Design a protein around this ligand. Structure first.
Ligand code: NAG
Ligand code: NAG
Ligand code: NAG
Ligand code: NAG
Ligand code: NAG
Ligand code: NAG
Ligand code: NAG
Lengths: 139, 224, 317, 158
């Protein structure tokens, strides 16, 4: 698209590829300002070791003056989250995030993220000479 | 046989849906979403009116009270172009939203025409489970349905069989299946357990019991 | 005889940053775009609504069971071989043979493609549970609670629903089972040989790619200015002769972005209509038997099995 | 952060004859007496009093305020706004006569102010303090229900 991508070095005559350094959309997830005032921040599609180093070097143009957290970093395929704790237990989804991850506000309360839950799991046994007939109903 | 139980279930269902409608605040999501979308469009149009679009001022009367009729013309042209773009954008968004609402209105119209005035055998079009009837109610810029449904519960295991034969002739059920019960066999319908004695009235004959898999030897009561 | 019928469900989610696309890193270009007040937040809100609509489409189509069912250990139900439809535990991936042969058949601009809420294994789990529920619980697991029925008696009931008595099924079960197996093998061969059978999903992907490509290419025009690169304008002019060129770039790129947003809105409306049609088709054709003629398959209808597809669903009526 | 004593415009607050000087050190003098104000020889005629000074376009704005406070060593947390007093076409200050003054710095940032009916400034929350504050500043409301929202874009400054 008529974009300067590669440059020959004017002095030592070597090869330099030019890339744009990391940027993207940011989002905030909150449980609503009726239960708490703590939120969590999602940075989209960055391998955020770069983001952590650049925010500890204080070079991000979103200037969060008093916000600096690096104790809870979780990595997803949609980006990475700061402010949520990873929980292995599956629950029904409260707010969507992406790639099967949903945040919620269950347990003292805090923002937790987990894996999507399919629903109520069950297994119906098969036999080839048995039938099931209901005997009651409810309008 | 059990009209009073069904009437009590009906009354409990109406009282339950009344309580569920009166307690919570988030059940009419869609109508609130329509109203909020329209309000947001009008608000952003009115706010976009307040920009200068690169002119020396954003108020037309201030332009016409501070310039002659050859230096104000270019500023007036810039205001015309910007406000024309904003109004055209609002008209296009309104057209698309009206198309979506028209699709929803046609779906609701055919739903009430095929669900209130008649009973529909299309599964899962009106209510969850089987469908008996439905009552419509008005709503602010909308319609709210109350579908009444008949769902079965309290399932029970049984031993079944495809067919039985008595003297070399296969017997097939008319409308229903065969249930063993742990006693002599019975015939029943597929949605409510009400056994009856096997009889030639509700059973028809075809072929011999040599080719159909799983025939049971049993007696067939003839009413003489 | 079984037949296929392919429908789209969702298209590619996308988003565009208004400040990154129109202007570069110059803050004066941000000021000149802020002169066109409160304009480019509308576009971002519209595309966010589009992404939410795509996730809603996929959730409304596929997740129509309140419980799921384990895949049975045996894949042989009275002569009906179901090994090609249900997933097998041998492969490390949990997708069936049909799904595996069907998936394989089809920056400087701030452009991002957000991932879907449900992955491929997510939809595969839904499809496997739905197919197993059809194969075991019969036609009563979405219309109330699941009630286990043998497959032969369910076949007899469905034949009775068509208008053919049960003795016709029970007298020649082996012939019907052989026809079923031959039909599945035939549709597998027809899916694996040709290259043009999934026209619609390829058309959706190609339309989206063409829109993105023509937007990126339209970024490279000068719109009557002295140059088409904003940094070359800001490195060759002062702050009163570059303003008019910046204004022309703002106007042209604003027109291009607005056109792309409008085309995306109309295409999303078309995909939403297709998704609602597919949702009601599976709700009235898999979980039950439909007496509407020529809605599911050619001829009379017995049942149908759904399968996943890249941004879509494929029926086997 | 504020400096307790027990660039582009400074903030002043003090819990008493008060004087100001401004220059690159002929002299710019501001003297406030108990009754009279003397200032280009322009002549005109506990608690916390707040003066806000700003300088742009060759002009200097002076803003004044007043609030009755409690006698305590530090400054209590509270809310009040100050009205403008005057403007002139043309950093350390000395005062004399148990007394304290505090200096804070000014930065170009965005606010969002909530008025009222019969309304002065009643409440305000910053737009560059917390991600919740940025969310409040973007949705343009004081009450946000549960959900996910997009606010801005992040970028690394080279
Ligand atoms: C240019 O300057 C560099 C630095 O002194 C030197 O190494 C080089 O030989 C010079 N000539 C060319 C042709 O690069
Ligand atoms: C991010 O980068 C580090 C170092 O380059 C690497 O170890 C890590 O795997 C990367 N993350 C992902 C998700 O690839
Ligand atoms: C159905 O269940 C209700 C509540 O348990 C019970 O009162 C009723 O007798 C049951 N129906 C029959 C036919 O027994
Ligand atoms: C039916 O029997 C099977 C095994 O005999 C059992 O696992 C299943 O729970 C039974 N169904 C009910 C509803 O009790
Ligand atoms: C079904 O079996 C029970 C024994 O479990 C028996 O008491 C009952 O009479 C049988 N049903 C009929 C209709 O006879
Ligand atoms: C049910 O399956 C078993 C397992 O092979 C088989 O032996 C039996 O014959 C089947 N039932 C009938 C009625 O054929
Ligand atoms: C079902 O078809 C598959 C196709 O490869 C075959 O491997 C399997 O043995 C068949 N099942 C039978 C014959 O029971």
């Amino acid at each position: 698209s008529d974009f300067t991508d590669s440059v020959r070095d004017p002095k030592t005559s070597e090869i330099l590829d030019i890339s744009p350094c990391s940027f993207g959309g940011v989002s905030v997830i909150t449980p609503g300002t009726n239960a708490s005032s703590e939120v969590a921040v999602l940075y989209q599609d960055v391998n955020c070791t770069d983001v952590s180093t650049a925010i500890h070097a204080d070079q991000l143009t979103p200037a969060w003056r008093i916000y600096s957290t690096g104790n809870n970093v979780f990595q997803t395929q949609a980006g990475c989250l700061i402010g949520a704790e990873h929980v292995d237990t599956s629950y029904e989804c409260d707010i969507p995030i992406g790639a099967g991850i949903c945040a919620s506000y269950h347990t003292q309360k805090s923002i937790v993220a987990y894996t999507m839950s399919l629903g109520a799991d069950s297994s119906i046994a098969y036999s080839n000479n048995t039938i099931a007939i209901p005997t009651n109903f409810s309008i | 046989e059990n009209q009073k139980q069904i009437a009590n279930q009906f009354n409990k269902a109406i009282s339950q849906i009344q309580e569920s409608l009166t307690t919570t605040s988030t059940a009419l999501g869609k109508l609130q979403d329509v109203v909020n979308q329209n309000a947001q469009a009008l608000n952003t149009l009115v706010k976009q009116l307040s920009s200068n679009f690169g002119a020396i001022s954003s108020v037309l009367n201030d332009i016409l009270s501070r310039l002659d009729k050859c230096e104000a013309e270019v500023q007036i042209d810039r205001l015309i172009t910007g406000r024309l773009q904003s109004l055209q954008t609002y008209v296009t968004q309104q057209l698309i939203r009206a198309a979506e609402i028209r699709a929803s209105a046609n779906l609701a119209a055919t739903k009430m025409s095929e669900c209130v005035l008649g009973q529909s055998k299309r599964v899962d079009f009106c209510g969850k489970g089987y469908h008996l009837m439905s009552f419509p109610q008005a709503a602010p810029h909308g319609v709210v349905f109350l579908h009444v449904t008949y769902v079965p519960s309290q399932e029970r295991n049984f031993t079944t069989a495809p067919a039985i034969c008595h003297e070399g002739k296969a017997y097939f059920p008319r409308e229903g299946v065969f249930v063993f019960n742990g006693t002599s066999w019975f015939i029943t319908q597929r949605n409510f357990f009400s056994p009856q004695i096997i009889t030639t009235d509700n059973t028809f004959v075809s072929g011999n019991c040599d080719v159909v898999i799983g025939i049971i030897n049993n007696t067939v009561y003839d009413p003489l | 005889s079984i037949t296929t019928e392919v429908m789209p469900v969702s298209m590619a989610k996308t988003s565009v940053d208004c400040n990154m696309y129109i202007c570069g890193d110059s803050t004066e270009c941000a000021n000149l775009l802020l002169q066109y007040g409160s304009f480019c937040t509308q576009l971002n809100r519209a595309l966010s609504g589009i992404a939410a609509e795509q996730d809603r489409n996929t959730r409304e189509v596929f997740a129509q069971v309140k419980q799921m069912y384990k895949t049975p250990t045996l894949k042989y139900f009275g002569g009906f071989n179901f090994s090609q439809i249900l997933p097998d535990p041998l492969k490390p991936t949990k997708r069936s043979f049909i799904e595996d042969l069907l998936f394989n058949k089809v920056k400087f601009n701030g452009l991002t493609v957000l991932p879907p809420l449900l992955t491929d294994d997510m939809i595969a789990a839904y499809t496997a549970a739905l197919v197993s529920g059809t194969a075991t619980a019969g036609w009563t697991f979405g219309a109330g609670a699941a009630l286990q029925i043998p497959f032969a008696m369910q076949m007899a009931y469905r034949f009775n629903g068509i208008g053919v008595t049960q003795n016709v099924l029970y007298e020649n079960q082996k012939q019907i089972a052989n026809q079923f197996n031959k039909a599945i093998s035939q549709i597998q061969e027809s899916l694996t040989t040709t290259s043009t059978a999934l026209g619609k999903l390829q058309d959706v992907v190609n339309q989206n790619a063409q829109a993105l490509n023509t937007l990126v290419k339209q970024l490279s025009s000068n719109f009557g200015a002295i140059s088409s690169v904003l940094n070359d304008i800001l490195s060759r002019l002062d702050k009163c002769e570059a303003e008019v060129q910046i204004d022309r770039l703002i106007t042209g790129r604003l027109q291009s972005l607005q056109t792309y947003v409008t085309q995306q809105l109309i295409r999303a409306a078309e995909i939403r209509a297709s998704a609602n049609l597919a949702a009601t088709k599976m709700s009235e054709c898999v979980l039950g038997q439909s007496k509407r003629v020529d809605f599911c398959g050619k001829g009379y209808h017995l049942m149908s099995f759904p399968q996943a597809a890249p941004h879509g669903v494929v029926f086997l009526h | 952060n504020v400096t307790g004593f027990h660039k582009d415009g400074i903030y002043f607050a003090a819990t008493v004859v008060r004087g100001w000087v401004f220059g690159s050190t002929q002299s710019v003098i501001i003297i406030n007496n108990s009754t009279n104000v003397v200032i280009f020889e322009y002549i005109s005629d506990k608690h916390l009093r707040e003066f806000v000074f700003k300088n742009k376009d060759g002009f200097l704005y002076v803003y004044k305020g007043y609030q009755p406070i409690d006698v305590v060593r530090d400054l209590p947390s509270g809310f009040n706004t100050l009205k403008p007093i005057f403007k002139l076409p043309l950093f350390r200050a000395i005062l004399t006569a148990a007394a304290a003054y505090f200096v804070g710095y000014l930065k170009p940032t965005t606010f969002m102010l909530k008025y009222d009916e019969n309304g002065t400034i009643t409440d305000a929350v910053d737009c560059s303090q917390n991600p919740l504050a940025e969310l409040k500043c973007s949705v343009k409301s004081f009450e946000i229900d549960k959900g996910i929202y997009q606010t801005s874009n992040f970028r690394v400054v080279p």
